Amino acid sequence: RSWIQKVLEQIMDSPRQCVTPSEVVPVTVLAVQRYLLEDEPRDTVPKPPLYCYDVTISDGVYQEKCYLDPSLNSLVYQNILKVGIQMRISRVSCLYNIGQGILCIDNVHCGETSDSISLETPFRNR
Amino acid sequence: RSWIQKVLEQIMDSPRQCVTPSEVVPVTVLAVQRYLLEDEPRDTVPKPPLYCYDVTISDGVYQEKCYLDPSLNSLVYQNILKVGIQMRISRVSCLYNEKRIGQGILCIDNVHCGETSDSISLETPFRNRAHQEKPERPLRGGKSHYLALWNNEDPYGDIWLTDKQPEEHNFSDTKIISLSHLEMTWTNRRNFPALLVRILHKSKLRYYGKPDKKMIEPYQTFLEVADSSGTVSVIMWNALCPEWYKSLRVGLVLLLQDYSVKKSYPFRIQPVPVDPQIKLISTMEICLNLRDPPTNIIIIPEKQVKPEWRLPKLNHRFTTRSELDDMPENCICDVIGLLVFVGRVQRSKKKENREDFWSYRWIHIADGTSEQPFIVELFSTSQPEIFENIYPMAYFVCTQLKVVRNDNQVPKLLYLTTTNESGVFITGHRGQPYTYDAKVKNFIQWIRTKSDSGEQKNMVIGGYYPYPPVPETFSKYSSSIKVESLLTAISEVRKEIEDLQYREQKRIAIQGIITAIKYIPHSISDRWESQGLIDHLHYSRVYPESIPRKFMFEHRKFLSDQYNSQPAKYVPPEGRPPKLDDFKSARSLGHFEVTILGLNHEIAIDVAFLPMYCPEDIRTSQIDTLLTSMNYSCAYPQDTTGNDRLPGPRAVAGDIIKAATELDRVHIVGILDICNLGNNKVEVYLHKIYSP
DNA sequence: TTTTTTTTTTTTTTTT
């Protein structure tokens, strides 16, 4: 039923090797919040971004907070990934940075402004 | 003392001058190799051949590796100049290699190739020790190498090493990144860290050595290795291929370092792997050139492998005949089963280069899921040791086979082809290398059960097997021939037969009337006629090699060598061999000598009709007509009973004669396969007599 | 298809 539920159970069942969402449905961004990127190797030649973000998607059933891949920080730098806009994830992982997990977004296709953004959908994870 | 010594002493002091040898003594050919003809002037209107040949003629005393003047390559294209033959050199010349310190080279310039020698000695000493250098190389050139005698996709010579073994490289402080990491960051990484990849597909060799450009080992192989989720088409360059190709098998965990990353070649077609979950990185490709230190390629043993990391396992798409019955046009698949037929080494000219050739051989793989085999089109997969030596009574597995279907004709052409990444192997008695697969287990169980039932399959080797069956609709046959002169001239057959090279195949159509037919029992009237021409062709000769032979394990090397490709070097017979005729013929009915009259009653031709259908076919009406050469099964009789209560093959004979008699003056377009079996022997056989 | 070597990078916190 719920897209986030299906994705979570799928990545739990199949190996969590950047599982591609079996089904892709537009999802509405409800929040984009930033914090410092701690606990990173920071030794690669392409040094990682200093800050990371935690998008808050909503599939109409539940709203789940997802840790955006730092590689996709340009989309938020350019204000292409803002509130309201409905996106379409194309890759997902299951990080454990553990209790339940941290649904990670490895790719996304930012869409157009949504007309049915609901602030009433309860959080799947309390 | 010896002819070699006398001629060399006579012509040593006159380089690049042609002198008839003082004495013409027959000399035995002990080896014939082929390599590129660079360094020749490509300004002559008749551009010199793209390849030259070296022949190791042997006298009674010594054998001195000579050089065949490229103008004589015609004698090798027709395989008239083969190993074990006796020839009488008529013209010689001396050439000195200016990139090597050595003596003169005998330059063969005219020969009169005769017949096989009575006594061939493989122990005659080498006059010039330089010719005996263990890493054998061509006489001309500095760092040249010999290619395979006929095809260019088969490793040949001593440059190809098999010494590579697993090495235990410590992973203490090795910086290993993922393929996706390069995909995202390879245009900014000044240095590319180490990698830990695993081979998924290994491609067939590819020779890109043009004659003018100066290259060393123009050999290039594409390996689809996958580290973690990512997969890229690694491509080895230059002289790296002949140091790692005969050793790297699919499924070896490679550790590549000091590599290069570039853009994917525009005309590259990366093959999809079995697992879809992986990422197919198709933007950048890793190039492995030969670095001065031998650390660029290091293979780590499976024990050193750590499940702690994720490495893509080698999967397969094993399919049975029943599954193939429904598989679509193009769907790459793997096949396994008991070989039940082996064809000949047919050669088809490449459209890219009219001088190069392919080397395919039609094979049949048997299984328990159907009464028909897979009918695979097996090209040379850069595995001569297996390709040449395959025989029916064994377990054979081929991977990455592309389905090919054609419903334009009634007998659906459900057969397979070998793609670039297709590999060949002969599994053990129990199937040890592929035992892990379930389909492999099923096949082994089927073979064990059938053997425990005291049953054997009809095993056939070589012969005349034109798998492609010409349709029943002459209109469709013409449609497949798009403005290519579908009907060859009755007087052109001579020229076409003169154009085929060694084991070349070609299909043409002739227009004429059935002059007559004489039945030739394989061993009811025996002969019949329909009834002064401009000229007539006598091509109704069926060679012993053309008749398929029932396989007997006791004599397997002999049978496999009678339908293989001609060897490059000599190998003395291991005793007195048997005769090909003493082996029973898999054909159940004899051939015919149908003679065709030209439409204008001016040119005639003699052709042989060698049917493959059994009396069971003419009873069950599995064939198209009585003038066809292949049954709808296109499979040699399964010998379910060997001999049935059906009309005997002698009855089918005479019946075919009268069937032809029906086509007394009927205008027909017969499809006549023409092939050059070697030497000057050429076969012209009938396929199907299209009638209105 | 060919095709190798080289490095460059600046900046405002802690006290127990």
What is the residue type of B658?
A: K
Question: In this structure, are strands B67-68 and B105-110 parallel, antiparallel, or unpaired?
Answer: parallel
Establish whether the CB of B123 is closer than 7 Å to any nucleic acid atom in strand C: no
Chain A nearest-CA distance from B189, in A, is 7
B70: left (phi over 0), alpha (psi -120 to 50) or beta: alpha
3-class state of residue B200 by DSSP:
strand
Are the beta carbons of B511 and B667 closer than 8 angstroms?
Answer: yes
Over the range B104-141, which residues count as b (16 or more CB within 10 Å of their CB) and which as e?
A: bbbbbbebebeeebeebeeebeebbeebeeeebbbbbb
Rounded Cα distance, A7 and A18, in Å: 11
Rounded Cα distance, B311 and B370, in Å: 37
User: How many Cα atoms within 13 Å fall on the side-chain side of residue B621?
Assistant: 0
Sign of CA dihedral B109, B114, B115, B121: negative
Rounded Cα distance, B492 and B495, in Å: 5
Please name the residue that has the structure tokens 């067939």. B204
A37 CA to C13 C1' distance (Å): 20
Rounded Cα distance, B589 and B654, in Å: 11
Q: How far apart are the first and last CA of chain A?
A: 19
Tokens encoding A115: 């007309």
Q: CB within 8 A of B657, min separation 6: which ones?
A: B517, B519, B525, B527, B528, B592
Tokens encoding B671: 């499809």
| 3-state helix/strand/coil string of B208-261 | CCCCCCCCCCCEEEEEEEECCCEEEEEEECHHHHHHHCCCCCCCCEEEECCCEE
The H or E element containing residue A50 is none
SS percent in chain B: helix, strand, coil, step 5: 15, 30, 55
- Are residues B188 and A71, on separate chains, in Cβ contact within 8 Å? no
Question: In this structure, are strands B360-366 and B376-379 parallel, antiparallel, or unpaired?
Answer: antiparallel
Are the beta carbons of B335 and B401 closer than 8 angstroms?
Answer: yes
Residue B533 CB neighbour total at 10 angstroms: 14
Number of H helices, E strands in chain A: 2, 6
The H or E element containing residue A2 is none
Distance of CA B609 to the CA centre of its chain: 26
Rounded Cα distance, B458 and B640, in Å: 9
Are the beta carbons of B684 and B608 closer than 8 angstroms?
Answer: yes
Number of H helices, E strands in chain B: 12, 32
CB-CB neighbors (< 8 A) of B175 in chain A: none
Give the Cα-Cα-Cα angle B363, B682, B657 (nearest 5 degrees): 85
Residue B304 CB neighbour total at 10 angstroms: 15
SS percent in chain A: helix, strand, coil, step 5: 15, 35, 50
Tokens encoding B338: 């008991």
- Are residues A20 and B277, on separate chains, in Cβ contact within 8 Å? yes
Over the range B625-658, which residues count as b (16 or more CB within 10 Å of their CB) and which as e?
A: ebbbbbbbbbbbbbbeeeeeebeebeebbebbbe
Distance of CA B225 to the CA centre of its chain: 27
Q: CB within 8 A of B633, min separation 6: which ones?
A: B372, B617, B622
Tokens encoding B477: 């046959």
**Residue B292: nearest nucleotide (C-alpha to C1'):** C4
Among B247, B200, B269, B202, smallest CA distance to B228 is for: B200
Residue A104 φ then ψ, to 5°:
-100, 145
Residue B569 φ then ψ, to 5°:
-105, 160
User: How many Cα atoms within 13 Å fall on the side-chain side of residue B26?
Assistant: 14
| Nucleotides in chain C near protein beta carbons (<7 Å) | 1-8
Residue B484, exposed/middle/buried by CB under 10 A (0-12, 13-18, 19+)?
exposed
Are the beta carbons of B295 and B325 closer than 8 angstroms?
Answer: no
Rounded Cα distance, B37 and B67, in Å: 11
Rounded Cα distance, B549 and B459, in Å: 9
B183 touches chain A (CB under 8 A): no
Rounded Cα distance, B609 and B599, in Å: 20
**Residue B238: nearest nucleotide (C-alpha to C1'):** C2
| Residues in a beta bridge with B339 | B365
B188 touches chain A (CB under 8 A): yes
Among B691, B622, B689, B626, smallest CA distance to B657 is for: B626
B189-194 CB contacts, 8 Å cutoff, 24+ apart: B189/A45, B189/A46, B189/B261, B190/A45, B191/A45, B192/B259, B192/B260, B192/B261, B194/B255, B194/B256, B194/B257
DSSP track, B399-423: EEEEEE---SSSS---EEEE-TT--
Breaks in chain A at C–N > 2.5 Å: after which residues? 97
Among A43, A108, A45, smallest CA distance to A74 is for: A108
Rounded Cα distance, B621 and B643, in Å: 18
Residue B35 φ then ψ, to 5°:
-150, 170
Radius of gyration of chain A (CA): 14
What is the residue type of B459?
A: M
Distance of CA B72 to the CA centre of its chain: 24
Tokens encoding B560: 């496999």
What is the residue type of B520?
A: I
In window 278-337 of B, residues with CB < 7 A from nucleic chain C are 287, 289, 291-292
Tokens encoding B260: 């290069």
Tokens encoding B53: 């040949």
Among B486, B497, B484, B487, smallest CA distance to B599 is for: B487
A122 touches chain B (CB under 8 A): no
Distance of CA B158 to the CA centre of its chain: 21
Among B376, B372, B370, smallest CA distance to B335 is for: B376
Are the beta carbons of B192 and B261 closer than 8 angstroms?
Answer: yes
3-class state of residue B361 by DSSP:
strand
Q: Chain A residue with minimal CA distance to B184?
A: A71
Rounded Cα distance, B683 and B497, in Å: 9
Rounded Cα distance, B418 and B271, in Å: 13
Rounded Cα distance, B641 and B595, in Å: 34
Are the beta carbons of B593 and B518 closer than 8 angstroms?
Answer: yes
Rounded Cα distance, B233 and B227, in Å: 11
| Residues in a beta bridge with B67 | B107
| Residues in a beta bridge with B318 | B334
DSSP 8-class letter at B266: T
Instruction: Write down how long chain B is.
Output: 692
Rounded Cα distance, B581 and B418, in Å: 33
Over the range B583-593, which residues count as b (16 or more CB within 10 Å of their CB) and which as e?
A: bebbbbbbbbb
Residue B493 φ then ψ, to 5°:
-55, -35
Rounded Cα distance, B433 and B426, in Å: 9
What is the residue type of B171?
A: F
DSSP 8-class letter at B187: S
Among A82, A75, A26, A11, smallest CA distance to A49 is for: A75
Distance of CA B12 to the CA centre of its chain: 40
A102 touches chain B (CB under 8 A): no
Residue nearest to nucleotide C1 (CA to C1'): B265
A97 CA to C16 C1' distance (Å): 31
- Are residues B185 and A71, on separate chains, in Cβ contact within 8 Å? no
Residue nearest to nucleotide C6 (CA to C1'): B190
Sheet containing strand A51-58, edge to edge, reads A86-87, A27-36, A51-58, A63-68, A102-108, A89-95
Rounded Cα distance, B226 and B196, in Å: 9
Resolution in A: 3.0
Are the beta carbons of B72 and B109 closer than 8 angstroms?
Answer: yes
B443: left (phi over 0), alpha (psi -120 to 50) or beta: alpha
Please name the residue that has the structure tokens 């290699």. B97
B442-448 CB contacts, 8 Å cutoff, 24+ apart: B442/B368, B443/B336, B443/B337, B443/B338, B443/B367, B443/B368, B443/B395, B444/B395, B446/B367, B446/B368, B447/B338, B447/B395
Are the beta carbons of B242 and B161 closer than 8 angstroms?
Answer: yes
Are the beta carbons of B408 and B380 closer than 8 angstroms?
Answer: no
Q: CB within 8 A of A14, min separation 6: which ones?
A: B277
| CB < 8 Å from A in window 271-290 of B | 277, 279
3-class state of residue B33 by DSSP:
strand
CB-CB neighbors (< 8 A) of A15 in chain B: 310
| Residues in a beta bridge with B512 | B598, B668
Tokens encoding B300: 């780590």
Are the beta carbons of B51 and B34 closer than 8 angstroms?
Answer: yes
The H or E element containing residue A26 is none
Are the beta carbons of B26 and B81 closer than 8 angstroms?
Answer: no
Rounded Cα distance, B185 and B179, in Å: 10
A19, A45, A92: which to substitute to probe chain B, counting the most B Cβ within 10 Å?
A45
Looking at the partner chain, which of A17, A20, A46 has a beta carbon nearest the beta carbon of B185?
A: A46
Chain A nearest-CA distance from B441, in A, is 27
- The CA distances from residue B257 to B291, B293, B297, B450, B563, in Å, are 10, 11, 7, 51, 44
Residue B216 CB neighbour total at 10 angstroms: 14
Are the beta carbons of B614 and B635 closer than 8 angstroms?
Answer: no
Are the beta carbons of B196 and B178 closer than 8 angstroms?
Answer: no
Residue B365, exposed/middle/buried by CB under 10 A (0-12, 13-18, 19+)?
buried
Breaks in chain B at C–N > 2.5 Å: after which residues? 523, 531
Q: How was this structure determined?
A: cryo-EM
Establish whether the CB of B206 is closer than 7 Å to any nucleic acid atom in strand C: yes
Residue B5 CB neighbour total at 10 angstroms: 14
Rounded Cα distance, B465 and B457, in Å: 18
Are the beta carbons of B406 and B469 closer than 8 angstroms?
Answer: no
B420: left (phi over 0), alpha (psi -120 to 50) or beta: alpha
| CB < 8 Å from B in window 5-24 of A | 14-15, 17-20
Q: CB within 8 A of B679, min separation 6: which ones?
A: B78, B79, B80, B82
Tokens encoding B365: 């793989």
Rounded Cα distance, B447 and B422, in Å: 24
Are the beta carbons of B551 and B559 closer than 8 angstroms?
Answer: yes
Question: In this structure, are strands B284-288 and B230-236 parallel, antiparallel, or unpaired?
Answer: parallel
The alpha-helical segments, DSSP class H, found in chain A are 3-13, 74-77
- Are residues B229 and A17, on separate chains, in Cβ contact within 8 Å? yes
